[PDB]
Amino acid sequence: DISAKDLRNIMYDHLPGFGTAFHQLVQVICKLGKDSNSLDIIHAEFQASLAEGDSPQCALIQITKRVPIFQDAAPPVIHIRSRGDIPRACQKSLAPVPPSPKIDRGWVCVFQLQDGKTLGLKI
Amino acid sequence: PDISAKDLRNIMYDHLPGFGTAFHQLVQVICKLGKDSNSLDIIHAEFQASLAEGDSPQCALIQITKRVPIFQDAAPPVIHIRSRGDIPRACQKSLAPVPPSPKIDRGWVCVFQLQDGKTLGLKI
Amino acid sequence: PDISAKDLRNIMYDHLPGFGTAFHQLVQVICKLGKDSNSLDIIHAEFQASLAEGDSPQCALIQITKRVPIFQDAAPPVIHIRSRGDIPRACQKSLAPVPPSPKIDRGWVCVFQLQDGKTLGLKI
């Protein structure tokens, strides 16, 4: 049995850089995974994807397409003060938020700014 | 499943007052995502139990969206319509601006997308 | 919005018993904050859904304070009055000493402040 913190660190162990769209997706996947008691199936698929030769980014996308809790799941909204509060490595990954964003379509999270503006983090 | 999506819809419609209400829309959303996630039997069982406990059928539908995993943080479907007049009369006092990332278990039943591009959230 | 602050107030008043009660004051608090935050349609839709679900209108108003974002961390408005007599009769039995950081979503509807400086919180 793996904890949410331990699984997040395993995933971070593989990812290049820091504050990337993929780091955020790790946090999203571990939160929904913990809350749905899906951490072990997530862990097992992540390990098999890597063994099969997938990039760790692609292992994470495969989890969102395959693990039942991500079926139809919408991204969380993260309240922040201003756009400068979004990690640098996320700054070229932001796009207008559609009506009904889904994580398994690549909408990782939505930033909502203090002025009301929303910016969708997109892969 | 012991129960088809069509038969479950009809059972739920059997208890709901009126026609074209926000709760009729929610029945349709529930049966669709229930069919697609192979959840129809659990949804039907919970609906029956809520009624036996004395819940209104409206309350029974809300409980499904809180308790069945496919509805947890679920993106509501987008329904393409020509104009605001295409939304059923009984849903017309339930429309609101769509927030970022609406969730069905937060009362966002569906999003109507107008031809001109505008959206209206159906809210309970 | 699809509904004005006045019209929404009147719809809520249509379902409340009595006159000058703590819940009538809450309707005023909700419609003011809703107007100022462009939330009247969401508030209206939630009130309609609560009534359809079989909730009392009083519970419907409490639910709005718990679910509509503008009420999160919201302090009760201060209403400046001349004497205890300026408080509507049906509210006189709902007054309590005001704690350090009162919140609407914890049932502190408003705070009456007398000319002498004394304060009484309207509590549900």
Place this chain on the structure above:
Amino acid sequence: PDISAKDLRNIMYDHLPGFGTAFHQLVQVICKLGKDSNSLDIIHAEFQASLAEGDSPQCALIQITKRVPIFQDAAPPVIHIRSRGDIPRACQKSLAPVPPSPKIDRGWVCVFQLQDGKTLGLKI
């Protein structure tokens, strides 16, 4: 205790509609765990208070599963049966696939295991 398992079962059945419902099965489940954990008196006291408060007897039973310690992390008992036809008629619309780690306090009342090895969960 003040009350035997049989007498408690009979008190609960006194208040339940019908025969062979999912809530009758839940009574049996509650009385067996209560007897084995010496919890019958706390279960009786709570059932009585829920009825006094105006709760349906079905809600009263659900609250016991949420409040009484023995039901925490408690899995539904497995009931061996020959075929689906041996499940009482009033439970036939409450059957669903069994998840890993089902919990009584999440509404999995029991699990029926058929002769051919298939399993069906009784759900509220």
